[PDB]
Fold this protein.
Amino acid sequence: AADLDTQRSDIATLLKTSLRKGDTWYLVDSRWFKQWKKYVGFDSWDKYQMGDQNVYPGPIDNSGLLKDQSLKEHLIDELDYILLPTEGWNKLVSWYTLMEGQEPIARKVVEQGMFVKHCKVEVYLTELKLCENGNMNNVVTRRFSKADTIDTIEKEIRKIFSIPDEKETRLWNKYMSNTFEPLNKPDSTIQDAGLYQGQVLVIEQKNEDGTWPRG
Amino acid sequence: AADLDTQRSDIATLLKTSLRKGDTWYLVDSRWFKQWKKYVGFDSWDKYQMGDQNVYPGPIDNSGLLKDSLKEHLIDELDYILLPTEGWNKLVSWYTLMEGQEPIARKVVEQGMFVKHCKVEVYLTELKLCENGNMNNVVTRRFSKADTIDTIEKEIRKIFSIPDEKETRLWNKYMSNTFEPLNKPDSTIQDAGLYQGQVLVIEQKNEDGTWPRG
């Protein structure tokens, strides 16, 4: 076995281990653990029997969490068991053994991705430079919120250059000199579209012909 | 004005005010704000000049933050602190706003952020799986809540030896015999509203190009 004081020290430390999707963690019946906590004096409120061999936990016993080898339903962490990382687990078995006729209870970490909405004070509105294929020198500046959509913008350009509700158009994002990317997701927000301060947007009007002025 | 102890504490809880989309907050130059702090004993480790005129902030001055009109790459907390409407008015009513100056009002914007939550998955989700032509031939698998409809379909395809060539579609079949189409391959089992013991049915397109269920 080990020094009783390092047993609690090391385990105390391993319990802090951070969850990494994929890693394997093991279950330990909360009852056995308590026998082990009492006997190692883990808690500052029950560290009064460490050493007593009448509170020797013996082999690790997980049978409480088991109906068959099959995990009882509605089990709650720190309630019916605690969890340990590969390391801290092996350390426990190498001090006490695993009660013959039982296989370890291994489970995996699951990661759930999600898009949270958070509020910030928009100190800088995104400043765009707007113009039209006809006259590239007539640049008009507008400031939008990052939460504003492309649609909100296209409609603003339309209004600025008095483009008819009935005329078809397309919108181009000018990322770098001589480089044009379409902006064809009306409902995309400025943030989601990756438009940044000072960016040039070019609107193109469809010819009375059907053809586009740019090709 | 108001006494220093209340100025400090008033402003202190106001700073903790919550960010609500559409709300208006006001910028204050850190230069002025650091002075106010010292003048009011805001920071507890720095109360030594509390009430000295040496550190009397003055009227509120944001000209540091302007060009001759907002300077770029200002940082929050470093160049400026932000105050709710009420906190602003208080400061103005205490030291007012320097002449030739307007407040710097900005609004709360809401924005997306991708975060990841992790846990030990103690109980996997059990599903029943079958091929549409054969309903009585049911096979159970246990999946992770993180698995996708696509990952599940692939698995089912193996179980029933459905060569890739065959196109397939997937259904959640309810006790009522309602067939719900699972047609978002990238939804996780959870995001797809799939639950322990539910029944999934894989349907193969006919050779002639028609679907069994139409």
Q: What stands out?
A: The first strand of chain B starts at residue 24 and ends at 29. Chain B touches chain A at residues 19-21, 25, 27, 70, 74, 76, 80, 82, 106-123, 144-146, 188, 190 (CB under 8 Å). The domain at 1-123 of chain B is CATH 3.30.2230.10 (DUSP-like). Helices of chain B lie at 4-14, 30-40, 85-95, 149-159.
